[PDB]
């Protein structure tokens, strides 16, 4: 009876979502003029990493950036002067994520050791010191995001997400609705709510304050590796291993547009938006990053010039440039 | 055209670059091996003989540093982390030999280990990575094979009930699973109570992989 009730409710939600799909964004955006093809040129090339890059995050001043690699090193760079600001040696080399504080005081890093280590960048002694190590997860950490100085939401491979505070060290909130390993997180600009992507071909919209799931998106055929909020905060885009990106709405609670091409069969490792949201940059497994446009959904450019799988990318908070890290041990800046 | 503070920052960056270069040169000279195997096989016993999230064990034998990584604890999806370990000298693979007739609810434990062996061996990340197969228990298998025939484990088996024939047969069955014989050679050893023999065999296999890597680096091969 319970399974039958679940089936009839799922049918009801399916019909109600089809009752609001009278129009499509593909035909609405027909009238707008096509943007000129975005031909970017590498303004900087950062050298000093020896192993592969796993994550990057921009600072709030659009000048500092962090990168993590399998030589045990987390390196903070100045992009303008193409030099190194900090080099932090990690206790566990198998790091899979990094995050930068909105205040710029702290960095976090998680890995296979099921521990999220937090480092303080502004000490009186002048050396980087680990602040707090969080070990409450039974699975490898996939992502971490700083809500603020004192709160940090983390994502882990044990089919759950956890919101922690750093002063006490206890998990303040627990988010458990996924049936597969959870791969990614993205925060709203106003920090009210966050989205999570997992290995069950679904993405969930949670709530920070009450601590309960708000929405559930089930439209993919393969697992979701990348998630990013739209800058307005009322939509998001996905990225999966079946060579397609999909645009979901927090309001319509369903898919809006599909970014796919016939000659692409490779996996999508990272997704990021432009400041206006007009462009959508997607890092593929074909050794190049393709730039699409959100509205029309045709290709607007290509960023080639990497020697191995592109694993991460990010646009600055003011949108002046975009950095791409990859498995070739390099980190490039395009504009 | 450069201020004093900017020049000092460039000097600091050069010092960081020098320290990173020294750390990279130190890091390159150490041999890292993943330790795979089923749970009840007895990997911990092999670790204790040679000596939460990730277990790293480092030992020095014949002026060559070895770091051993143990991924057994994590019960998550194995594909998601099977690509960070792409660069690796060899894969130790420990299989219990005395569980041919044991049934754990898969019909046979031996199939539960051959499945893992097939999954790891026929992988894109480890096309050329060598595999070092250890049969963990020999005396208990001898006592069992005396007390119980192997005809239950394998539908079709030869007449010879001798321990050597059964050992050879199991070894051939594990070696058969490799579908690319030329690129990767699997080394099969019999675990004994002598630590020196096992460490020496691992050292010889690692030495052969180092010989292959040197041949690739020079370009002669």
């Amino acid at each position: 009876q319970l399974r039958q009730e679940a089936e009839q409710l799922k049918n009801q939600i399916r019909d109600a979502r089809k009752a609001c799909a009278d129009a499509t964004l593909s035909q609405i955006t027909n009238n707008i003029d096509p943007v000129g093809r975005i031909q970017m040129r590498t303004r900087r090339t950062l050298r000093g990493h020896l192993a592969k890059i796993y994550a990057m995050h921009w600072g709030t001043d659009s000048r500092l950036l962090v990168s993590a690699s399998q030589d045990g090193k987390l390196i903070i760079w100045d992009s303008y002067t193409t030099n190194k600001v900090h080099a932090i040696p990690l206790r566990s080399s198998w790091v899979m994520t990094c995050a930068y504080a909105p205040s710029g005081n702290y960095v976090a890093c998680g890995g296979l050791d099921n521990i999220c280590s937090i480092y303080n960048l502004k000490t009186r002694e002048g050396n980087v010191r680990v602040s707090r190590e969080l070990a409450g997860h039974t699975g490898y950490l996939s992502c971490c995001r700083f809500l603020d100085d004192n709160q940090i939401v983390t994502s882990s491979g044990d089919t759950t997400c956890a919101l922690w505070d750093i002063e006490t060290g206890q998990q303040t909130t627990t988010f458990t609705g996924h049936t597969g390993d959870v791969m990614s997180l993205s925060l709203a600009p106003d920090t009210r709510l966050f989205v999570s992507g997992a290995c069950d071909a679904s993405a969930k919209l949670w709530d920070v304050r009450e601590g309960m799931c708000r929405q559930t998106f089930t439209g993919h055929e393969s697992d979701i590796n990348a998630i990013c909020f739209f800058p307005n905060g009322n939509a998001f885009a996905t990225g999966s291993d079946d060579a397609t990106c999909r645009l979901f709405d927090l309001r319509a609670d369903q898919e809006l547009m599909t970014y796919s091409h016939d000659n692409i069969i490779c996996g999508i490792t990272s997704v990021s938006f432009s400041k206006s949201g007009r462009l959508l940059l997607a890092g593929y497994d074909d050794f190049n990053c393709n730039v699409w446009d959100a509205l029309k959904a045709d290709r607007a450019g290509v960023l080639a010039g990497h020697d191995n799988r592109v694993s991460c990318l990010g646009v600055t908070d003011d949108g002046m440039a975009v950095a791409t890290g990859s498995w070739d041990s390099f980190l490039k800046i395009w504009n | 055209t450069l201020s004093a503070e900017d020049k000092a920052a460039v000097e600091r960056s050069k010092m960081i670059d020098r320290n990173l270069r020294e750390d990279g040169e130190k890091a390159a000279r150490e041999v890292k091996l993943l330790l795979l195997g089923a749970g009840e096989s007895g990997k911990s016993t092999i670790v204790k003989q040679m000596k939460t999230g990730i277990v790293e064990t480092h030992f020095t034998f014949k002026d060559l540093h070895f770091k051993m990584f143990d991924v057994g604890a994590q019960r998550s999806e194995r594909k998601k982390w099977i690509h960070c370990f792409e660069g690796v000298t060899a894969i130790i693979f420990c299989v219990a030999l005395s569980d041919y007739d044991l049934v754990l609810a898969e019909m046979n434990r031996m199939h539960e280990s051959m499945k893992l062996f097939d999954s790891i061996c026929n992988n894109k990340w480890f096309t050329d990575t060598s595999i070092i197969l250890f049969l963990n228990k020999k005396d208990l298998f001898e006592e069992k094979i005396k007390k119980s025939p192997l005809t239950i484990c394998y539908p079709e088996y030869a007449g010879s009930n001798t321990y050597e024939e059964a050992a050879a047969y199991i070894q051939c069955q594990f070696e058969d699973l490799n579908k690319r014989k030329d690129t990767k050679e699997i080394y099969t050893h019999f675990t004994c109570s002598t630590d020196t023999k096992n460490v020496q065999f691992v050292f010889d296999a690692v030495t052969d992989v180092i010989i292959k890597n040197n041949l690739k680096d020079c370009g002669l091969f």
Partner: single-chain antibody, 234 residues
Framework: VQLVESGGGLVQPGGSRKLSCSAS????????MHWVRQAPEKGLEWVAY????????YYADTVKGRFTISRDDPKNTLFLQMTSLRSEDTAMYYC??????????????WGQGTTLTVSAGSADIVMTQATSSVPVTPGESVSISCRSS???????????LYWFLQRPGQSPQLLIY???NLASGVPDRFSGSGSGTAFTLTISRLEAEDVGVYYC?????????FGAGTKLEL
């Protein structure tokens, strides 16, 4: 964070002496170090600087050659060797830690200082303060102005002006670095402002502890010339 100076004593002219600075509680290996001298009736004067790793060493023009500076990183000790001492070299010496990178605050910690008593540049920016003393009362705001003989506004947008307070019988303290950012451990009352050569520090709602000499400093070019010093009074 402690710096302890030693090796200072009264000497006859022509003697040779070694100064030793003992850094404790912090990472002395990655910090560039300065020696700065203060005359009894004159302002603070920079003497020398050694960078991290001893890559670049700079000296004042007057004391160039004769004074030599060395640093020992494992023992965390700074040595200054002084030879051919004269009448002019009768000052109070400060050992100063400074680290240079983007967003850093140099000259954050100032040493206690030792005393040396002797029983006897055209390209330099002449930093000039128009006032020697401002008598005021606690509670009311005060503005003290510093002026430069060369534009400190570099191409990158930074204006290398540093504000220091020296209470009587105390070490100097950094208030504002690069004439914009308030330094740590300093209340929000102090504020630096100004355009080009013109520079105005403002101290709203003055309190009893604000009494002391104020020094403006430039950092545009290597012979660092300090200011005369505005002795604020009650």
């Amino acid at each position: 964070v402690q710096l302890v100076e030693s090796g200072g004593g009264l000497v006859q002219p022509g003697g040779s002496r070694k100064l030793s600075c003992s850094a404790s509680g912090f990472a002395f290996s990655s910090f560039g170090m300065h020696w700065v001298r203060q005359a009894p009736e004159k302002g603070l004067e920079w003497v020398a600087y050694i960078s991290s790793g001893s890559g670049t060493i700079y000296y004042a023009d007057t004391v160039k050659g004769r004074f030599t500076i060395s640093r020992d990183d494992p023992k965390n000790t700074l040595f200054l060797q002084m030879t051919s001492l004269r009448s002019e070299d009768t000052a109070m010496y400060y050992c100063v830690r400074s680290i240079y990178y983007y967003g850093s605050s140099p000259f954050d910690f100032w040493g206690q200082g030792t005393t040396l008593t002797v029983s006897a540049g055209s390209a330099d920016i002449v930093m000039t303060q128009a006032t020697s003393s401002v008598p005021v009362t606690p509670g009311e705001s005060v503005s003290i102005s510093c002026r430069s003989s060369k534009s400190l506004l570099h191409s990158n947008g930074n204006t290398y002006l540093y504000w220091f307070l020296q209470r009587p019988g105390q070490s100097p303290q950094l208030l504002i670095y690069r004439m914009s950012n308030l330094a740590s451990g300093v209340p929000d009352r102090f504020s630096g402002s100004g355009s080009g050569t013109a520079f105005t520090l403002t101290i709203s709602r003055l309190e009893a502890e604000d009494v002391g000499v104020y020094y403006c400093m430039q950092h545009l070019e290597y012979p660092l010339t300090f200011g005369a010093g505005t002795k604020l009074e009650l």
